[PDB]
Amino acid sequence: NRNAFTGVSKQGLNRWKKNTFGMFIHWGLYCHRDLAGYYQGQYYDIISEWLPHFARIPMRDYKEYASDFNPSEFDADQVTALAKTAGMNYMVVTAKHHDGFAMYHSPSHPFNITDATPFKRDPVAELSQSCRHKDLDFGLYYSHVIDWENENAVSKAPNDWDFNPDQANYQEYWNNKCLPQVNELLEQYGDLCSLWFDMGGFDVQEEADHVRRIGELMALIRKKQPDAVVNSRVTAPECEYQLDWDIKTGHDNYMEPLYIKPYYWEGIATSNDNWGYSRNDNNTKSSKDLINQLCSVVSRGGNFLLNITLDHNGRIPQSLVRLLSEIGQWMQVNQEAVIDTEATPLQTGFNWGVVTHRPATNKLYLHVQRQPEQNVICLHSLNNRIKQVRLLDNQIKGHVSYLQKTHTDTGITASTLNLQLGHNYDRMPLVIELEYDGELDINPIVHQDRLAKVRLDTLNIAHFDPEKLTYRWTFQIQSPGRFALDLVSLETMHHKDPQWVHNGKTGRISCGGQSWEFELNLDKTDTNDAQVPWKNIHSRLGELHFPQAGEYTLEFSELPLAIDQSEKYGQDYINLEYLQLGPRLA
The missing domain is CATH 2.60.40 (Immunoglobulin-like)
Known part of the structure; x- marks a missing residue:
């Protein structure tokens, strides 16, 4: 029902499609020399952005950090050159995160890096200017729902240490801070490729009030930035059909199923375990892993955003300069296989x-x-x-x-x-x-390969019914025999402590006149090339006998499988990577 709303301009959506791969920048006062995941000398296991909320830092004290926040080595040309080096074509920057601190010159609000710090500079202005000079598309993120600095901005994550959520008037936050700040972003920095939002579901006002305000917000964006792509995290999933927006957002880091979505979307990844600068984080991802995730997202039909940050001095950490330089060296050779390419049309995935x-x-x-x-x-x-x-x-x-x-x-x-x-x-x-040669001509067959293996995956599935918990594939056997059947399912849970949660679950296989119950066991772990750090878990379900060459149908039943959408934390659905039939000693 996108056609029922104004929407981004055609030329704005086409620019985003062609661009494909972008940079995200999380940077704020939470990256302070005395913060960045520490408070009063103590390490907290939290993303930097959430430290003010986790450690309940009184805003009178939090605002005092601005007085010696001076990222004096900030260089917008260095940042945009690193984006271009990496082969990225757009950048999206945090203008204001949940801490309520403007990382740009806000005329309407004094809590902003230009007025409140010795920096005395507008880094959003400098980045927008550098982007214009280097033909990189430039966009902004604004935390519209969550604001811990404003006494009226009550949400599902309220500042209940400085303020009383019961006394909040959300409309005053909205009229006095949110809308004037969004207007600044829409006016001060030229043509924006993207306006980015999250935590849309954290709004605690009545649904009708949320829908009215997001509708008004979106109308303002289409009026002042008609070419800007907006993501559906501006609202909750249950209000998306009621509101204007252009694209969705995938999981943070966790790879979507191999399934071509009926909507436009970005996948988004961190370059380490955090978003904004985290002093103790030495878990930098490899260029190999992030290239594989980029390619895996584009194979699924998504855009991809890779997040970086800057330290309190305004330096890009050397490990992220190295990472993006390594991605760039690969992209220089291989970009035509990724940028402005379509999702797989082969109607199957592959192990390799x-x-x-x-x-x-x-x-x-x-x-x-x-x-x-x-x-x-x-x-x-x-x-x-x-x-x-x-x-x-x-x-x-x-x-x-x-x-x-x-x-x-x-x-x-x-x-x-x-x-x-x-x-x-x-x-x-x-x-x-x-x-x-010729117009592409594909037949959706699933076929035993040169090595006597059959891969059954989320893309080549024949039928699925999540209500009846039935999942069916039809495939061709050229080489008869007795073959092992393995379920390959994913770890879930938080990226700092990934876990496989499916031990002991029972289901059924039916195929070639054979039918039995299995019990899942952790039989083998393997890296999953598209996921970090969640692994493949192999569970041997049993053995199937194919007495001759021909067509067989296999039904997996009595246990739910995630085919077209997956959860990172909920444990009812098994995240299928693939089912494999193959030689029982391979």
Whole structure:
């Protein structure tokens, strides 16, 4: 029902689609030399942004930190150059977070970095100016619902240490601080690619009041920044159908199921365990992991935002300069396989990586994230002739050979790529560009591969009914026998303590006239190339007998599987990566 609202301009949405990959910046007073996850010399296990709320810092005391906040080495050109180095095409910056501190010159409010600190500079102005000079699209985040500085801004996370939530008049916060500050953002910094919001569901006012205010907010944004993309976290999921917005937001860090969503969305990741600068955080993610997550999101049809920060001196931490420089060196070679590409059209995933699509030039990009088993990639859904394959990176030593065989009995084309190379997937993934002849022609088949394996995943599923808890795949066996059946499911729970929560759960398999109950056990752990740090857990369910070649149907039942949407914390649904049939000693 997006067509029922004004919406972003066509040219604004097309700019966002082409851009693909962006930077997020969380930076504020919470990055102070004496804060950044510490308070009064004590470490708190909390993201920096939430330390004022977790440690209940009286605002009279919190505001005193502004008096010696001077990030004197801040350099907007250094920040935008690092975004461009990384191969990012847009940046979104926190103008005001939950702490209520404006990281820009706010005429309406004195609690702002230009007026209240010895910095005496507007970093949002400097970044917007640098972005204009370097043709990088520039957007802003504003914490519209949560504000711990304003005595009226009551929410589900109230400042109940300085103020009494019962005495709040939310409309006064809204008229006196929220709307004047949003107007400043819409007027002071030129054309905005994005206006970004979160915690829309933390509004404790009546639904009708929320809907009226968000409607008015959105109308103001379309009027003053008609080309700006807005995310649905501006509200709660149950009010999305009532309100204007352009795109959704995926989980923080946790990878969406392999499923093409019927809406536009960004995935979003941290570069470490925190958002804004956290003094003790030495858990910097690898370039390899974040490239794999970028490619995995674009294979699903999403945009992707990677968050960075700056320390209290206004320096980008060296580990994040190194990280984005390493991503950049990869993007310089491989960006055409990621930026402005479409989601996989193959109607199946693969254990070895993911696929993106450039239909205008008849290209499929195979993102090889781990060594394919025996150096072979098997396709059965591609009907087109392959004109050629090439490594995008001409410094990789070796060659990709391929065969295509059209089986005259089934009409199925078996395409087999043979990787003759010696690449270290631990350092970075590699891209094979496959050019196909004619308009892309795919048949949604699930087929046993060269190594006698069948992958059943969230993309190639035939039928699912979350009410009846039934999940069905139909697939072709070319090599009969007795094969092991494994469920590969994900860890969940918080990124600093990932856990697999499904021990002892019972369900059923039915296939090829065989039917039995299994009990899930943690049989094996493995890295999941698209997730950090959540791992794959393998549970051996049992054995299926395929006495001859032909078509079989397998039904998983009596246990819920997350197919088209997943939860990070709730434990009723099992987050499916895939079910595998294969050689019982592989």
